[model samples]
Target: GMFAGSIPMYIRVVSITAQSKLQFDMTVTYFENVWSPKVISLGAISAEFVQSNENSGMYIIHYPDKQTAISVFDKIKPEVDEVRTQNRIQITEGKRLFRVD
Candidate 1:
């Protein structure tokens, strides 16, 4: 089935115990604020905080419109690339879907 309206999104929390100088709560809080606007604009489906069995951040995002969705992706893709270069954060997992079903 095709979704006519808003889609869902999930972005997993990325927790780096070694690099993160801040406390757990502080890190989480910072991330929340930094990512909140983007998440909301893209129509976040859900966001979950995963425990760190390994050092990786997993997240999923569903866009309201194709243009907006792609726009969001295009904007962030470079940041991901840049971030990876510094070894600050790595996007371990990501999934994009056309619809929920």
Candidate 2:
């Protein structure tokens, strides 16, 4: 299994909808300070966020393929859940989100 096609096809998106503005900002902090670093080590190409609304933001994590994408998420589920719990937030998962699902 090796390189063949030349299109980036596996971008995974997940959205975090915070309960309030404070929570939203804090969640962003967690993603910036906590999540991104280790996620990159876990085989993420890059991970970033963009606000979609006052209390909702999306996380766009890039990986080489679906397998690596899901694998990274699976490996970091705890950190993800921690942010979710701390912000009292909800999430959406999909193949496309400006920042997330």
Candidate 3:
């Protein structure tokens, strides 16, 4: 079966372990203001906020273009670095795929 060529993609997973609304709000503000708007403009990239974990953070983005994804990574890195200087937030990258048994 000839399928379309591999489409480029990227994912970002950010964890906010704050147990208070104030913390979450502040984090969201920083992310929305500094991260979201810029990243959203890149190609077909999409964003989401997941609540799979408690004392957790939000997954702010899912990028379709590889370059845009990487660019988002680079841009957010500075914010992570700066925030890490004072707080502890776990940020990571991941991908979603289909599986069959």
Candidate 4:
């Protein structure tokens, strides 16, 4: 689907991993509990969870524009930094491919 806007969209990928399935689930749950509402309230277009392998997965968050995405990340920077320090989650940037009807 095509997003209706002039602003360029942005995608961010959060890679998650843990020692075990239970640990992974617990960490993901904790992350979503803290971040979900903040992201949604800040104008996220979509958030998807993609399972790549055992004990690891990717979370993709879509935003209407780069600034909106960056703003949300800035708001959560401290918490995200703490998570990275304690849990070793990896976050990376993603580029959009196409827009379709």
In every candidate, how many clashes are there?
2, 3, 2, 0
Instruction: Compute the lDDT of residue 10 as modeled in candidate 4.
Output: 78
Per-residue lDDT of candidate 2, residues 81-100 (tens digit): 77767565544444432443
Decreasing lDDT order of the candidates: 4, 2, 3, 1
The best candidate by TM-score is 4
**Consecutive 10-residue window with the lowest summed lDDT within model 2:** 92-101
* Better candidate by TM-score, 1 or 2: 2
Candidate 1: lDDT over CA atoms?
A: 0.47
Q: What is the C-alpha lDDT of each candidate?
A: 0.47, 0.72, 0.61, 0.75
TM-scores, all models, native as reference: 0.45, 0.71, 0.62, 0.77
Where is model 4 poorest over a 10-residue stretch in terms of lDDT? 1-10
> For residues 1-101, what per-residue lDDT tens digits would candidate 1 score against the true structure?
24454444423334344244344445446446766555556555444544353433333343444565556657778765654554455444344444444
Rank candidates by TM-score, best first.
4, 2, 3, 1
RMSD of each: 6.0, 5.7, 5.8, 3.3
- What digit string (tens of lDDT, one per residue) describes model 4 on residues 2-95? 7465434678889877777887788778657856666877777767777777677898888877788888888888888877765558878755
- Candidate that scores best on lDDT: 4
Cα misplacement distance, residue 20 of candidate 4 (Å): 2.4
Model 3: colliding residue pairs: 16-56, 16-57
